[PDB]
Curated annotation (Swiss-Prot):
Belongs to the peptidase S1 family. It comes from the Eukaryota. InterPro entries: Peptidase_S1_PA (IPR009003), Peptidase_S1_PA_chymotrypsin (IPR043504), Peptidase_S1A (IPR001314), Serine_Proteases_S1 (IPR050127), Trypsin_dom (IPR001254), TRYPSIN_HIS (IPR018114), TRYPSIN_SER (IPR033116). It comes from Bos taurus (Bovine). This is Serine protease 1. Interacts with SERPINA1. Binds 1 Ca(2+) ion per subunit. Coiled coil: none annotated. It catalyses: Preferential cleavage: Arg-|-Xaa, Lys-|-Xaa. PROSITE patterns: TRYPSIN_DOM, TRYPSIN_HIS, TRYPSIN_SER. One of its GO terms (molecular function) is serpin family protein binding. Keywords: Calcium, Digestion, Disulfide bond, Hydrolase, Metal-binding, Protease, Secreted, Serine protease, Signal, Zymogen. PANTHER family: RIKEN CDNA 2210010C04 GENE, TRYPSIN-RELATED. SUPFAM superfamilies: Trypsin-like serine proteases.
Length: 223
């Protein structure tokens, strides 16, 4: 997250870190057994880390649970990043508490202008490189589909939306991928892609979760 703020420990209780020896992507806890992330974050050997603030220090609220199964969306295209969503099942159920909590799925799509909270452990610089240990947060609005399409000609599908600031300076970034965009208490987006990070006229692009609720629910119900 570039241009954001330190969230505070366990203030984003649905945020998870995906770990394969090292943090590599975010995700969102949606029930005791299941995490939502980006399909481009797929790899084997995932350990889901819940209850994290500093990802390099054991602070006392963590739950580390190996994944048993990951399910990339049936129509994910890694070239275009269309349908950039996956589900990860935990080998054992998380113990839910005030610091480790699911986030609700939406019931309708969000609208341009809605404020959302974007979070992660990704790069905090737009030119350089600095990775934080504690979780970072950014409040940002959803942008109109027309401004999103104009910013990225030929690239924005109906399964994507833009959020952020056309002026630059405030965005998600590498290492935030897979993490949440939450608006009014609902998971509306997944950190997906962008041109660099925090660049003028290049807002962040996010997977449009509302399009996937049926698939998420039916997948959980039979897995
Ligand atoms: Ca920790």
């Amino acid at each position: 997250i570039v241009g954001g703020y330190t969230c505070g420990a366990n203030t984003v209780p649905y945020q998870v870190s995906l770990n394969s020896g090292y943090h590599f992507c975010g995700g969102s806890l949606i029930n005791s057994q299941w995490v939502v992330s980006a399909a481009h974050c797929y790899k084997s050997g995932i350990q889901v880390r819940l209850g994290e603030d500093n990802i390099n220090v054991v602070e006392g609220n963590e739950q580390f649970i190996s994944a048993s199964k990951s399910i990339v969306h049936p129509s994910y295209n890694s070239n275009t990043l269309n349908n950039d969503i996956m589900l990860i099942k935990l080998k054992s159920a998380a113990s839910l508490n005030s610091r480790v909590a699911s986030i609700s799925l939406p019931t309708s799509c969000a609208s341009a202008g809605t404020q959302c909270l974007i979070s992660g452990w990704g790069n905090t610089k737009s030119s350089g490189t600095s990775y934080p240990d504690v979780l970072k947060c950014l409040k940002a609005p959803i942008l109109s589909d027309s401004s999103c399409k104009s910013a990225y000609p030929g690239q924005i599908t109906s399964n994507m939306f833009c959020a952020g600031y056309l002026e630059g300076g405030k965005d998600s970034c590498q290492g935030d991928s897979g993490g949440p965009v939450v608006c009014s208490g609902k998971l509306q987006g997944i950190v997906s892609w962008g041109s660099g990070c925090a660049q003028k006229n290049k807002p962040g692009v996010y997977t449009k979760v509302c399009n996937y609720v049926s698939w998420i629910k039916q997948t959980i119900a039979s897995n």
